[PDB]
Design a protein around this nucleic acid. Structure first.
Length: 34
RNA sequence: ACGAGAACAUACGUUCUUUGAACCAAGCUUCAACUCC
């Protein structure tokens, strides 16, 4: 596509009233045995 | 006017009996439905 400068962009989401701008995919991890 | 003249090497008889093309062997391995507007 078109050529711009560094950096390009990131990708948050939108949900209203007001958009909250959360980043997609980030999660939490717990490991317990058996 | 022959050590000659006649005279079937012939008759009967299952290449047959017993026997697993078997045995052991993961269609599996690494693999983001993602990327950019």
């Amino acid at each position: 596509f078109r050529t711009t400068y560094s950096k390009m962009r990131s990708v948050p989401d939108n949900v209203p009233t007001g958009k909250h701008y959360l980043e997609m995919g980030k999660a939490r991890i717990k490991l317990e045995e058996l």
